[PDB]
Amino acid sequence: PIFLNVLEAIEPGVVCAGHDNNQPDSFAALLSSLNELGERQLVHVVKWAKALPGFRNLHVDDQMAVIQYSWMGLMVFAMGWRSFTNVNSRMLYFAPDLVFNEYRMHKSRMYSQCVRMRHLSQEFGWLQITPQEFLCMKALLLFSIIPVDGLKNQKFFDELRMNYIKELDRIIACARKNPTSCSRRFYQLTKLLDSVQPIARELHQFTFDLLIKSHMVSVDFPEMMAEIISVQVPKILSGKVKPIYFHTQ
Numbered sequence: 001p002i003f004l005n006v007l008e009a010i011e012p013g014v015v016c017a018g019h020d021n022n023q024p025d026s027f028a029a030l031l032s033s034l035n036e037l038g039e040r041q042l043v044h045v046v047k048w049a050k051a052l053p054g055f056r057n058l059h060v061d062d063q064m065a066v067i068q069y070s071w072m073g074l075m076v077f078a079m080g081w082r083s084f085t086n087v088n089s090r091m092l093y094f095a096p097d098l099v100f101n102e103y104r105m106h107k108s109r110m111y112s113q114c115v116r117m118r119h120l121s122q123e124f125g126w127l128q129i130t131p132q133e134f135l136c137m138k139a140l141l142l143f144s145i146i147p148v149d150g151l152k153n154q155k156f157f158d159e160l161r162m163n164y165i166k167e168l169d170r171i172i173a174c175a176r177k178n179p180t181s182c183s184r185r186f187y188q189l190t191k192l193l194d195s196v197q198p199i200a201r202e203l204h205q206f207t208f209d210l211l212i213k214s215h216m217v218s219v220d221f222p223e224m225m226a227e228i229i230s231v232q233v234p235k236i237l238s239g240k241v242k243p244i245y246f247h248t249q
């Protein structure tokens, strides 16, 4: 059980947003706290990714690029899981000190996006996703978005992705003596993974638009946050960098 041992060992712990929950809810305060949380989560995601089996097989510039492109999707998927395990998917558990109820979904001006994220969280319950399926799916999500023109060394990436697919297949919750069971399960989980990508795109769009207007609406963007959103995110939004889907959309 070496692979699952590693994934459990490297899984990030609790990350707080630093939000003041004693102040009335406002757009500026909610989004400033989400941005700070995004910066804090990025730091954890980088450390996590660099500790994954085989990650150092990637060329050095490909390493940071892969992390940066996948960051939003990784955050959303983990947040959906937190929401499932902590509040039964009824609210969005961004952090212990930043939990969105319906009022905050509205006040953040992100209601439609939050609906999609809550639906993702509900899928963990509907499909009875195991914590081990979650960990393997999240690892595979890192290797699910790349430039259409390819990476510096695309071969090493393709091999990594292949192996992460095989590890997911190995531990899916099914009865092996009935092949139909495992086929159905793999189909369900690949559909679930695909569904992260349109959600990440909506968040990319929202966050990009907010950065551009941030001076007008009093929303603060931290340094590393802002660089990714102005340099890497537009490569996604302009179609230079595209998600890898299992099924044809």
Ligand SMILES: CC[C@H]1[C@@H](O)CC(=O)N1c1ccc(C#N)c(C(F)(F)F)c1
Pocket: 031, 034, 035, 037, 038, 041, 072, 074, 075, 076, 077, 079, 094, 117, 203, 206, 207, 210
């Ligand atoms: C990253 C940018 C900020 C906001 O500007 C838009 C938005 O949705 N953000 C955000 C923050 C933190 C987490 C976490 N965890 C998430 C999610 F969970 F949705 F990925 C989004």
